[model samples]
Target: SMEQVAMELRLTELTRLLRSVLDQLQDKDPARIFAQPVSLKEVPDYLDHIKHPMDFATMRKRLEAQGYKNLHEFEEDFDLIIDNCMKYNARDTVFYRAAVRLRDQGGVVLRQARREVDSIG
Candidate 1:
């Protein structure tokens, strides 16, 4: 049924995207434990791929006008994003917002994962 497939897709993609995030963070920071600047120029393009509302895509544009240049600039909003993910508490909606966010800013590497498909499928 669609219900089961919905979460199966989102959660599985979430893990794959999450792994891509960690790898980018590790490559960018080298130590893999510290935060560092990741480019912002091509970020929103990546964010466009996530299945979510356009409002965030619009809001995310504000960073450009603010002279922002890296993903860390939005750490201030991370808590709020994280809060939304925490509020849902369901496999389908769990981290839904945050996961969408994981696609933007220091998120360039994520486009790599979203473009790939499982050969077995």
Candidate 2:
């Protein structure tokens, strides 16, 4: 968990450092939405700017409201959501949301881990 937190921080710094060099990315897309083809190496960065279909807030709300006492309960409840995600082929659309949510989850876990790590001190 600490590793993930550290990586997130590093990635953030890397993005910040490249901001000037990558200024074009902040503006309009260089490759005009299939009108021009994106380079093979450029696809990943371009995809980062794409929006995901998942309503992450709503999903978080649903997860919080369920109030599961343990992972098993949470897993059981999440089965339907996972099924719907598959049925809707959400991976194709909401993958970016998954990345953001993953980082957020890592932050939450990292906070707890820090507390635990500090308890002995």
Candidate 3:
């Protein structure tokens, strides 16, 4: 019973952390580029370049589904969102620049999460 309680708290903290990360990402993304899945109609070559596409909406759905068993899993999806953009777009493009900025800030958030969550009993 005690273990279960601790697990529940951990889950709660993780969810909160995930939401904070998503919020910051959205705030950084003014163009809504990462808001939804890359439109195949608009960017016909998107799928051709990015094999594993990820976006905020899809991440939210997965988060609600509890698809992430741990912080690393959550971070993987977070990284994927940025990585896909960087991979698909040229280094000089806006998308690439945004991805770099997002990734840099996201790293700080993830580190803060680890520090807070690791302190849990």
Highest-scoring model, TM-score = 3
lDDT of 2 by residue, 1-121 (tens): 9998876665444334333222322122222221122343755554354332232233344344433333344333333333333443355565434433444443454355335334632
Which ranges in model 3 have alpha carbons more than 4 Å from their true place? 1-9
Q: Which clashing pairs does model 1 show?
A: none
lDDT of 3 by residue, 1-121 (tens): 9999988877776777777766876777777778899989999887778899999999999877756768788788888999988888899998899899888877777787777667752
Model 2: which ten-residue window has the lowest total lDDT?
Answer: 26-35
- How does each model score on lDDT? 0.39, 0.37, 0.81
Give the TM-score comparing model 3 with the true structure, all chains together: 0.83
Off by over 4 Å in 1: 32-121
Which sections of candidate 2 miss by over 4 Å? 1-66, 90-121
- For residue 44, what is the lDDT in candidate 3? 89
Q: What is the TM-score of each candidate against the true structure?
A: 0.28, 0.23, 0.83
Alpha-carbon shift of residue 19 in model 3 (angstroms): 1.8
